[PDB]
Amino acid sequence: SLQLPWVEKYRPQVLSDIVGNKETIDRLQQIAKDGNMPHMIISGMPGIGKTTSVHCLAHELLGRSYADGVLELNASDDRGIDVVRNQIKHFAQKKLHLPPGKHKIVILDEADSMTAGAQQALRRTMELYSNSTRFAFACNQSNKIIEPLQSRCAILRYSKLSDEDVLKRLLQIIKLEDVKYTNDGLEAIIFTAEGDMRQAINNLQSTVAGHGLVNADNVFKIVDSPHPLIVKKMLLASNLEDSIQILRTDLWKKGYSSIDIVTTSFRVTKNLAQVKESVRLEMIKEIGLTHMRILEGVGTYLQLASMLAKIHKLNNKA
Template identity: 60%
Template sequence: MAASGISQGGKDYHLPWVEKYRPSKIADIVGNQDAVTRLQVIARDGNMPNLIFSGPPGTGKTTSILALAHELLGPNYKEAVLELNASDDRGIDVVRNKIKMFAQKKVTLPPGRHKIILLDEADSMTSGAQQALRRTMEIYSNSTRFALACNISSKIIEPIQSRCAIVRFGRLSEQDILNRLLDVVEAEKVAYIPEGLEAVVFTADGDMRQALNNLQATFSGFQFVNQENVFKVCDQPHPLLISSMIRHTLEGNIDEAYRGMKHLFDMGYSASDIITTLFRLVKNYDMAEYLKLEFIREVGFAHMRIADGVGSLLQLAGLLAKLCKARTRAKAP
């Protein structure tokens, strides 16, 4: 979710920050400028097609749909918009009852405006429900528009895809998230140090919703946002420990690298937690490009084996040995 609406801050004291600072205007949405520009054109012209919003969690899909609906419908928003979470209401009966009944409902709207049905997590709908939805889209196309939010657009059946314009969202940049966090900490008078906000940005991994939740959780728990507190709340392996491990493998020091890995494993972090953080740090680590590609390849293979259920310390130790070996192989003439 992209967050903005800082002017709302200070009113709804008991709302989670992720809702308190949700943008109500398309122009306030952070990141994904191409997608935002397309939606601004739709809001200005008023001719909304059926839409599929596709992309990772926390990048602004649902927020964009809601903001677009508000700008198109204004005071008619409440009676002319139906919001459903398809992961809860994903059966064919929901399409035949709730969605069809709403599509049939008569609502007086300005010329060129349509009722809007928002289906969040639409890629979790059953195949039968999607087929029923396709028929409903055909029958009520004169009065109703559909906006489907999903993580993977390919899970939406092709007959629906062909009836929709697809708007793709990518993960937000670190700078976009940091700028929004700075606005929020100022509005909420959060005590922090810059390294603390950097840690929040790191844990979010391009997800604005995660960033705001982690910021609020850290402030609620400790009243101060620094690196140590953020990683305690988020319960992720500390990047400095992982970076130290990478440095030891680059130096060919397998014993020290293993000692660091065992320390993380003994702290209770799962192999999946460790390998995910390791991959993110390897991607951005300052090393020769050819060596980075070798490291990414080995980490990727290890990640695949861990995802298959082989998440032992031995698996992780084997990865460290392969990284050291890749470094040696890369140095060979």
């Protein structure tokens, strides 16, 4: 058998359970209760509650009619030319009786992967049959969908979840799962989440099944990313020779690529509150220079070594 992942076991079934973007969710709750659901294009970063919001809104709107009132299409299904002109038009033209205010919902999940030609053929399908059916869009990039489609929909841009929102939902999960935890353990999970509740649950679930008590040491053993404090010590070492030793033994010899080292270094530098806001921009600039060198193709150990030397030169010259 298997154990249900906490990503799916604690999936919100009601729109109220979703945390983050409190303004957008509150209006969505009013729409579900009242009716007349407008065309929306929910956009934002992955794992912030875009697909969940659409599914919760559809369930709270149709209810018992959700089985035959929703035509959900994702990237796995075919969303080509023939599907738009035949399958979607047939669903829109289908005569389904619903309580007043309720409307059929055509959920086109991951619309950024849809071709431009399919989107163009979908223009008049949503406009002509909006009396009986409605369209809901969820995507990671809002610019992938063509402009004329965006002119017929109320674009909702979901934002990154705040640290309070992610922590609040994690508290409910551990309370309902009887999970031993500490303050430093949860801070590491929020650090690795980066406003991604899906990644916060996965890190929390793996910590429990991996090493029991959720400590920061236990958390950072399973993310298999460069340790922020190891990178911070390398970026803030008083001696350049010590920092070079840290990079070689703990980052380069452990197989961490130059992209992950730079990404972790920029992440740690962004939160270095000890240093001044002027020097912080300079150290970010050197990381930006190093990241550019890797993208052209020069991503050897010397480029990372020079980045440490330039950063340590900034600290000593200050």
